[PDB]
PDB file of C-alpha atoms and ligand atoms in Angstrom:
ATOM      1  CA  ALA A   1      53.700 -23.636   0.101  1.00  0.00           C
ATOM      2  CA  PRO A   2      50.744 -21.404  -0.772  1.00  0.00           C
ATOM      3  CA  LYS A   3      50.567 -17.885   0.698  1.00  0.00           C
ATOM      4  CA  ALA A   4      46.822 -18.500   1.041  1.00  0.00           C
ATOM      5  CA  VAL A   5      44.483 -21.417   0.413  1.00  0.00           C
ATOM      6  CA  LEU A   6      40.941 -20.385  -0.566  1.00  0.00           C
ATOM      7  CA  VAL A   7      38.020 -22.592   0.481  1.00  0.00           C
ATOM      8  CA  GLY A   8      34.339 -22.059  -0.095  1.00  0.00           C
ATOM      9  CA  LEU A   9      31.192 -23.298  -1.769  1.00  0.00           C
ATOM     10  CA  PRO A  10      30.700 -22.820  -5.446  1.00  0.00           C
ATOM     11  CA  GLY A  11      29.790 -19.174  -6.023  1.00  0.00           C
ATOM     12  CA  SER A  12      31.605 -18.035  -2.874  1.00  0.00           C
ATOM     13  CA  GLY A  13      34.197 -16.142  -4.999  1.00  0.00           C
ATOM     14  CA  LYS A  14      37.216 -18.443  -5.194  1.00  0.00           C
ATOM     15  CA  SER A  15      38.224 -17.692  -8.826  1.00  0.00           C
ATOM     16  CA  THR A  16      37.515 -13.951  -8.554  1.00  0.00           C
ATOM     17  CA  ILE A  17      39.185 -13.419  -5.193  1.00  0.00           C
ATOM     18  CA  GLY A  18      41.966 -15.826  -6.193  1.00  0.00           C
ATOM     19  CA  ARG A  19      42.827 -13.838  -9.336  1.00  0.00           C
ATOM     20  CA  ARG A  20      42.729 -10.526  -7.415  1.00  0.00           C
ATOM     21  CA  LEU A  21      44.536 -11.777  -4.316  1.00  0.00           C
ATOM     22  CA  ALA A  22      47.161 -13.484  -6.429  1.00  0.00           C
ATOM     23  CA  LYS A  23      47.783 -10.210  -8.364  1.00  0.00           C
ATOM     24  CA  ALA A  24      47.978  -8.151  -5.136  1.00  0.00           C
ATOM     25  CA  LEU A  25      50.550 -10.549  -3.593  1.00  0.00           C
ATOM     26  CA  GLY A  26      52.627 -10.716  -6.740  1.00  0.00           C
ATOM     27  CA  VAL A  27      52.109 -14.497  -7.191  1.00  0.00           C
ATOM     28  CA  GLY A  28      50.503 -17.191  -9.404  1.00  0.00           C
ATOM     29  CA  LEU A  29      46.960 -18.585  -8.999  1.00  0.00           C
ATOM     30  CA  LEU A  30      46.433 -22.404  -9.073  1.00  0.00           C
ATOM     31  CA  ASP A  31      42.902 -23.874  -9.009  1.00  0.00           C
ATOM     32  CA  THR A  32      42.912 -27.562  -8.028  1.00  0.00           C
ATOM     33  CA  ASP A  33      40.087 -28.316 -10.488  1.00  0.00           C
ATOM     34  CA  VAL A  34      42.246 -27.050 -13.352  1.00  0.00           C
ATOM     35  CA  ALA A  35      45.213 -29.168 -12.194  1.00  0.00           C
ATOM     36  CA  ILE A  36      42.918 -32.204 -12.047  1.00  0.00           C
ATOM     37  CA  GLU A  37      41.798 -31.541 -15.607  1.00  0.00           C
ATOM     38  CA  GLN A  38      45.442 -30.961 -16.653  1.00  0.00           C
ATOM     39  CA  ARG A  39      46.724 -34.116 -15.069  1.00  0.00           C
ATOM     40  CA  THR A  40      43.919 -36.528 -16.037  1.00  0.00           C
ATOM     41  CA  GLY A  41      43.286 -35.098 -19.486  1.00  0.00           C
ATOM     42  CA  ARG A  42      39.591 -35.267 -18.573  1.00  0.00           C
ATOM     43  CA  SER A  43      36.739 -32.906 -17.717  1.00  0.00           C
ATOM     44  CA  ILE A  44      35.556 -32.767 -14.067  1.00  0.00           C
ATOM     45  CA  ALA A  45      32.063 -33.538 -15.367  1.00  0.00           C
ATOM     46  CA  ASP A  46      33.211 -36.713 -17.154  1.00  0.00           C
ATOM     47  CA  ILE A  47      35.017 -38.030 -14.069  1.00  0.00           C
ATOM     48  CA  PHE A  48      31.805 -37.599 -12.072  1.00  0.00           C
ATOM     49  CA  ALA A  49      29.540 -38.959 -14.807  1.00  0.00           C
ATOM     50  CA  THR A  50      31.597 -41.993 -15.713  1.00  0.00           C
ATOM     51  CA  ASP A  51      33.878 -42.771 -12.733  1.00  0.00           C
ATOM     52  CA  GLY A  52      31.779 -41.391  -9.881  1.00  0.00           C
ATOM     53  CA  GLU A  53      32.294 -38.843  -7.075  1.00  0.00           C
ATOM     54  CA  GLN A  54      34.465 -41.005  -4.853  1.00  0.00           C
ATOM     55  CA  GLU A  55      37.162 -41.650  -7.450  1.00  0.00           C
ATOM     56  CA  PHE A  56      36.994 -37.952  -8.134  1.00  0.00           C
ATOM     57  CA  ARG A  57      37.644 -37.135  -4.464  1.00  0.00           C
ATOM     58  CA  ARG A  58      40.692 -39.407  -4.260  1.00  0.00           C
ATOM     59  CA  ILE A  59      42.176 -37.805  -7.413  1.00  0.00           C
ATOM     60  CA  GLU A  60      41.282 -34.412  -5.996  1.00  0.00           C
ATOM     61  CA  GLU A  61      42.930 -35.238  -2.667  1.00  0.00           C
ATOM     62  CA  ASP A  62      46.150 -36.300  -4.372  1.00  0.00           C
ATOM     63  CA  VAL A  63      46.164 -33.114  -6.426  1.00  0.00           C
ATOM     64  CA  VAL A  64      45.415 -30.931  -3.356  1.00  0.00           C
ATOM     65  CA  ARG A  65      48.266 -32.519  -1.411  1.00  0.00           C
ATOM     66  CA  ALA A  66      50.787 -32.056  -4.221  1.00  0.00           C
ATOM     67  CA  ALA A  67      49.676 -28.452  -4.751  1.00  0.00           C
ATOM     68  CA  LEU A  68      50.081 -27.722  -1.008  1.00  0.00           C
ATOM     69  CA  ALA A  69      53.706 -28.828  -1.378  1.00  0.00           C
ATOM     70  CA  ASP A  70      54.647 -27.452  -4.858  1.00  0.00           C
ATOM     71  CA  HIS A  71      52.562 -24.258  -5.338  1.00  0.00           C
ATOM     72  CA  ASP A  72      54.015 -21.047  -3.894  1.00  0.00           C
ATOM     73  CA  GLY A  73      51.099 -18.739  -4.714  1.00  0.00           C
ATOM     74  CA  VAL A  74      47.380 -18.553  -4.022  1.00  0.00           C
ATOM     75  CA  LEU A  75      45.793 -22.001  -4.242  1.00  0.00           C
ATOM     76  CA  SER A  76      42.014 -22.353  -4.599  1.00  0.00           C
ATOM     77  CA  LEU A  77      40.338 -25.638  -3.764  1.00  0.00           C
ATOM     78  CA  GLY A  78      37.242 -27.067  -5.446  1.00  0.00           C
ATOM     79  CA  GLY A  79      34.154 -26.704  -3.262  1.00  0.00           C
ATOM     80  CA  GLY A  80      33.884 -30.322  -2.068  1.00  0.00           C
ATOM     81  CA  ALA A  81      37.580 -30.917  -1.362  1.00  0.00           C
ATOM     82  CA  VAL A  82      37.067 -30.342   2.390  1.00  0.00           C
ATOM     83  CA  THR A  83      34.655 -33.306   2.560  1.00  0.00           C
ATOM     84  CA  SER A  84      37.798 -35.473   2.401  1.00  0.00           C
ATOM     85  CA  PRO A  85      39.416 -36.088   5.811  1.00  0.00           C
ATOM     86  CA  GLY A  86      42.910 -36.316   4.281  1.00  0.00           C
ATOM     87  CA  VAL A  87      42.444 -32.901   2.610  1.00  0.00           C
ATOM     88  CA  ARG A  88      41.511 -31.274   5.956  1.00  0.00           C
ATOM     89  CA  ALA A  89      44.522 -33.007   7.550  1.00  0.00           C
ATOM     90  CA  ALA A  90      46.917 -31.764   4.862  1.00  0.00           C
ATOM     91  CA  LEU A  91      45.527 -28.196   5.255  1.00  0.00           C
ATOM     92  CA  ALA A  92      46.709 -28.115   8.887  1.00  0.00           C
ATOM     93  CA  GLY A  93      49.393 -25.429   9.318  1.00  0.00           C
ATOM     94  CA  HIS A  94      48.361 -23.456   6.221  1.00  0.00           C
ATOM     95  CA  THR A  95      46.827 -20.072   5.772  1.00  0.00           C
ATOM     96  CA  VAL A  96      43.254 -21.000   4.838  1.00  0.00           C
ATOM     97  CA  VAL A  97      40.751 -18.347   3.847  1.00  0.00           C
ATOM     98  CA  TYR A  98      37.127 -19.483   4.089  1.00  0.00           C
ATOM     99  CA  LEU A  99      34.964 -17.342   1.785  1.00  0.00           C
ATOM    100  CA  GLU A 100      31.485 -17.401   3.351  1.00  0.00           C
ATOM    101  CA  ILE A 101      28.334 -16.847   1.302  1.00  0.00           C
ATOM    102  CA  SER A 102      24.627 -17.105   2.046  1.00  0.00           C
ATOM    103  CA  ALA A 103      22.423 -19.567   0.175  1.00  0.00           C
ATOM    104  CA  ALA A 104      20.498 -16.908  -1.726  1.00  0.00           C
ATOM    105  CA  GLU A 105      23.544 -15.052  -3.000  1.00  0.00           C
ATOM    106  CA  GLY A 106      25.434 -18.264  -3.752  1.00  0.00           C
ATOM    107  CA  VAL A 107      22.421 -19.589  -5.691  1.00  0.00           C
ATOM    108  CA  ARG A 108      22.263 -16.293  -7.606  1.00  0.00           C
ATOM    109  CA  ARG A 109      26.011 -16.415  -8.418  1.00  0.00           C
ATOM    110  CA  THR A 110      25.959 -20.047  -9.670  1.00  0.00           C
ATOM    111  CA  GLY A 111      22.967 -19.664 -12.027  1.00  0.00           C
ATOM    112  CA  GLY A 112      24.381 -19.603 -15.602  1.00  0.00           C
ATOM    113  CA  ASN A 113      25.410 -22.426 -17.938  1.00  0.00           C
ATOM    114  CA  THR A 114      28.429 -23.745 -16.037  1.00  0.00           C
ATOM    115  CA  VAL A 115      28.292 -27.524 -15.770  1.00  0.00           C
ATOM    116  CA  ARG A 116      28.047 -28.476 -12.088  1.00  0.00           C
ATOM    117  CA  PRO A 117      27.648 -32.183 -11.253  1.00  0.00           C
ATOM    118  CA  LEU A 118      26.403 -31.443  -7.683  1.00  0.00           C
ATOM    119  CA  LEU A 119      24.319 -28.375  -8.427  1.00  0.00           C
ATOM    120  CA  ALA A 120      22.112 -28.964 -11.458  1.00  0.00           C
ATOM    121  CA  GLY A 121      18.380 -28.216 -11.789  1.00  0.00           C
ATOM    122  CA  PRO A 122      15.696 -28.422 -10.924  1.00  0.00           C
ATOM    123  CA  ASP A 123      15.707 -27.246  -7.304  1.00  0.00           C
ATOM    124  CA  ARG A 124      19.257 -25.808  -7.290  1.00  0.00           C
ATOM    125  CA  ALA A 125      18.408 -23.775  -4.172  1.00  0.00           C
ATOM    126  CA  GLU A 126      17.562 -26.885  -2.154  1.00  0.00           C
ATOM    127  CA  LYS A 127      20.793 -28.551  -3.290  1.00  0.00           C
ATOM    128  CA  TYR A 128      22.797 -25.415  -2.409  1.00  0.00           C
ATOM    129  CA  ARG A 129      21.290 -25.416   1.123  1.00  0.00           C
ATOM    130  CA  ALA A 130      22.100 -29.051   1.626  1.00  0.00           C
ATOM    131  CA  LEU A 131      25.764 -28.499   0.537  1.00  0.00           C
ATOM    132  CA  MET A 132      26.089 -25.429   2.778  1.00  0.00           C
ATOM    133  CA  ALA A 133      24.539 -27.119   5.824  1.00  0.00           C
ATOM    134  CA  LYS A 134      26.709 -30.195   5.428  1.00  0.00           C
ATOM    135  CA  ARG A 135      30.025 -28.394   4.670  1.00  0.00           C
ATOM    136  CA  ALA A 136      29.873 -25.257   6.870  1.00  0.00           C
ATOM    137  CA  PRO A 137      31.522 -27.022   9.853  1.00  0.00           C
ATOM    138  CA  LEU A 138      34.087 -28.562   7.526  1.00  0.00           C
ATOM    139  CA  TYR A 139      35.074 -25.130   6.137  1.00  0.00           C
ATOM    140  CA  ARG A 140      35.154 -23.767   9.673  1.00  0.00           C
ATOM    141  CA  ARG A 141      37.399 -26.506  11.008  1.00  0.00           C
ATOM    142  CA  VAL A 142      40.144 -25.835   8.378  1.00  0.00           C
ATOM    143  CA  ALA A 143      39.799 -22.036   8.103  1.00  0.00           C
ATOM    144  CA  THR A 144      42.333 -19.691   9.699  1.00  0.00           C
ATOM    145  CA  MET A 145      40.411 -16.693   8.372  1.00  0.00           C
ATOM    146  CA  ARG A 146      36.625 -16.386   7.877  1.00  0.00           C
ATOM    147  CA  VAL A 147      35.719 -13.828   5.192  1.00  0.00           C
ATOM    148  CA  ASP A 148      32.070 -12.913   4.619  1.00  0.00           C
ATOM    149  CA  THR A 149      31.788 -12.323   0.866  1.00  0.00           C
ATOM    150  CA  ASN A 150      28.071 -11.328   0.964  1.00  0.00           C
ATOM    151  CA  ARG A 151      31.178  -7.067   0.156  1.00  0.00           C
ATOM    152  CA  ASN A 152      32.868  -5.897  -3.102  1.00  0.00           C
ATOM    153  CA  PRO A 153      35.602  -8.226  -4.472  1.00  0.00           C
ATOM    154  CA  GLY A 154      38.149  -5.415  -4.188  1.00  0.00           C
ATOM    155  CA  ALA A 155      37.039  -4.857  -0.585  1.00  0.00           C
ATOM    156  CA  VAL A 156      37.123  -8.530   0.351  1.00  0.00           C
ATOM    157  CA  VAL A 157      40.718  -8.589  -0.981  1.00  0.00           C
ATOM    158  CA  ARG A 158      41.853  -5.533   1.041  1.00  0.00           C
ATOM    159  CA  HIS A 159      40.393  -7.266   4.108  1.00  0.00           C
ATOM    160  CA  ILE A 160      42.249 -10.511   3.299  1.00  0.00           C
ATOM    161  CA  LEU A 161      45.573  -8.704   2.642  1.00  0.00           C
ATOM    162  CA  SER A 162      45.246  -6.789   5.917  1.00  0.00           C
ATOM    163  CA  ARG A 163      44.496  -9.950   7.940  1.00  0.00           C
ATOM    164  CA  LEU A 164      47.326 -11.919   6.291  1.00  0.00           C
ATOM    165  CA  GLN A 165      49.772  -9.194   7.381  1.00  0.00           C
ATOM    166  CA  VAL A 166      48.880  -8.296  10.961  1.00  0.00           C
ATOM    167  CA  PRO A 167      48.501 -10.101  14.311  1.00  0.00           C
ATOM    168  CA  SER A 168      45.012 -11.308  15.328  1.00  0.00           C
TER     169      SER A 168
HETATM  170  N1  ADP B 201      32.704 -10.486  -3.057  1.00  0.00           N
HETATM  171  C1  ADP B 201      31.707 -10.663  -3.956  1.00  0.00           C
HETATM  172  N2  ADP B 201      30.500 -10.018  -3.876  1.00  0.00           N
HETATM  173  C2  ADP B 201      29.515 -10.212  -4.793  1.00  0.00           C
HETATM  174  N3  ADP B 201      29.649 -11.062  -5.842  1.00  0.00           N
HETATM  175  C3  ADP B 201      30.805 -11.768  -6.040  1.00  0.00           C
HETATM  176  C4  ADP B 201      31.919 -11.604  -5.083  1.00  0.00           C
HETATM  177  N4  ADP B 201      32.927 -12.406  -5.494  1.00  0.00           N
HETATM  178  C5  ADP B 201      32.504 -13.032  -6.626  1.00  0.00           C
HETATM  179  N5  ADP B 201      31.249 -12.643  -6.954  1.00  0.00           N
HETATM  180  C6  ADP B 201      30.458 -13.122  -8.116  1.00  0.00           C
HETATM  181  O1  ADP B 201      30.114 -14.503  -7.943  1.00  0.00           O
HETATM  182  C7  ADP B 201      30.099 -15.205  -9.192  1.00  0.00           C
HETATM  183  C8  ADP B 201      30.957 -16.469  -9.071  1.00  0.00           C
HETATM  184  O2  ADP B 201      32.222 -16.138  -8.491  1.00  0.00           O
HETATM  185  P1  ADP B 201      33.464 -17.183  -8.530  1.00  0.00           P
HETATM  186  O3  ADP B 201      34.723 -16.371  -8.248  1.00  0.00           O
HETATM  187  O4  ADP B 201      33.420 -17.957  -9.832  1.00  0.00           O
HETATM  188  O5  ADP B 201      33.081 -18.176  -7.289  1.00  0.00           O
HETATM  189  P2  ADP B 201      33.669 -19.655  -7.208  1.00  0.00           P
HETATM  190  O6  ADP B 201      34.895 -19.577  -8.083  1.00  0.00           O
HETATM  191  O7  ADP B 201      33.903 -19.891  -5.734  1.00  0.00           O
HETATM  192  O8  ADP B 201      32.593 -20.554  -7.782  1.00  0.00           O
HETATM  193  C9  ADP B 201      30.553 -14.183 -10.230  1.00  0.00           C
HETATM  194  O9  ADP B 201      29.407 -13.686 -10.938  1.00  0.00           O
HETATM  195  C10 ADP B 201      31.216 -13.071  -9.434  1.00  0.00           C
HETATM  196  O10 ADP B 201      31.129 -11.785 -10.050  1.00  0.00           O
HETATM  197  O1  S3P B 202      30.922 -28.526  -4.718  1.00  0.00           O
HETATM  198  C1  S3P B 202      31.622 -29.470  -5.169  1.00  0.00           C
HETATM  199  O2  S3P B 202      31.733 -30.556  -4.550  1.00  0.00           O
HETATM  200  C2  S3P B 202      32.354 -29.286  -6.436  1.00  0.00           C
HETATM  201  C3  S3P B 202      32.736 -28.039  -6.788  1.00  0.00           C
HETATM  202  C4  S3P B 202      33.549 -27.713  -8.019  1.00  0.00           C
HETATM  203  O3  S3P B 202      34.475 -26.650  -7.675  1.00  0.00           O
HETATM  204  P1  S3P B 202      34.033 -25.043  -7.447  1.00  0.00           P
HETATM  205  O4  S3P B 202      33.594 -24.897  -5.988  1.00  0.00           O
HETATM  206  O5  S3P B 202      35.326 -24.286  -7.787  1.00  0.00           O
HETATM  207  O6  S3P B 202      32.918 -24.729  -8.428  1.00  0.00           O
HETATM  208  C5  S3P B 202      34.189 -28.997  -8.596  1.00  0.00           C
HETATM  209  O7  S3P B 202      35.344 -29.412  -7.834  1.00  0.00           O
HETATM  210  C6  S3P B 202      33.184 -30.171  -8.671  1.00  0.00           C
HETATM  211  O8  S3P B 202      32.022 -29.923  -9.504  1.00  0.00           O
HETATM  212  C7  S3P B 202      32.666 -30.518  -7.271  1.00  0.00           C
END
């Protein structure tokens, strides 16, 4: 099972922190979005565009569940994976690091030309707020560790490592 599962909104630092945390723990990084792409042979964007969000979530849930069983490193979940009840259920018992970000910094971090089905213009800020407001309690319910990332990646990682190692 994963040493740590990373959850957070897009732009919260999953890929950055994941790479750095993985390195620090001497383990591999798996991103569930990449495994979805690997397994389906299809882009995340095409599944959304053609098949729709709900089929995406079921695929995503299956991939999350397998990864929770087969991956021994740091696992990062796509931002909406916690909207699925069965994903939250499967996360029970795991080490789950919620990377928290404010709207304004998250907006700022997600601004370039990455294709994002649920966060395209115009009005990305509005859309970011709606995703944050809706998902905050969902991230909170699965998290075993809340990490404010609004700090330096290196710092965030030292904090995570520390908190993985010692009693509450
Ligand atoms: N702890 C942090 N503080 C400030 N900026 C960060 C931090 N972690 C990541 N970033 C920045 O946020 C952007 C997106 O980070 P990323 O790791 O791709 O988030 P996610 O993978 O959750 O979408 C990048 O520009 C990255 O440099
Ligand atoms: O917010 C979401 O629901 C999504 C976030 C993406 O993952 P990241 O959070 O890694 O960008 C990806 O799974 C898809 O576009 C849906």
